[PDB]
Amino acid sequence: DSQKWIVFLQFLIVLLLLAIVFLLR
Amino acid sequence: DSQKWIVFLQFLIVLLLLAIVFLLRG
Amino acid sequence: DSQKWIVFLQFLIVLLLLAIVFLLR
């Protein structure tokens, strides 16, 4: 399913952005 | 159950990006 | 009403990323 891939990649993007925020602060 | 999840995740992404912008500013 | 919100949020993300790019310079 192509739609599920987008969601499962966006969750990883959210995790990576949280990591970026924590590394920045 | 898919595009609503996408919208929710993108709202989280926008919040995180705004946090990044305000951290880079100071 | 479904993908219109997606486009709106993508637009916000693009603006925020451009702001980050400018602020890094």
Added chain:
Amino acid sequence: DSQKWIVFLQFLIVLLLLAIVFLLR
């Protein structure tokens, strides 16, 4: 339609992330 706008905005997001990576290097 609006789906093509999502792809265009994602192209710009990739470009802006490339700019961020270049500015971090």
Added chain:
Amino acid sequence: DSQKWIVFLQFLIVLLLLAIVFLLR
């Protein structure tokens, strides 16, 4: 179609975010 291009661009976004995370730490 267009959805498969969105998935490819998200994969690129994940890779670039991994690069940013590695650079930060």
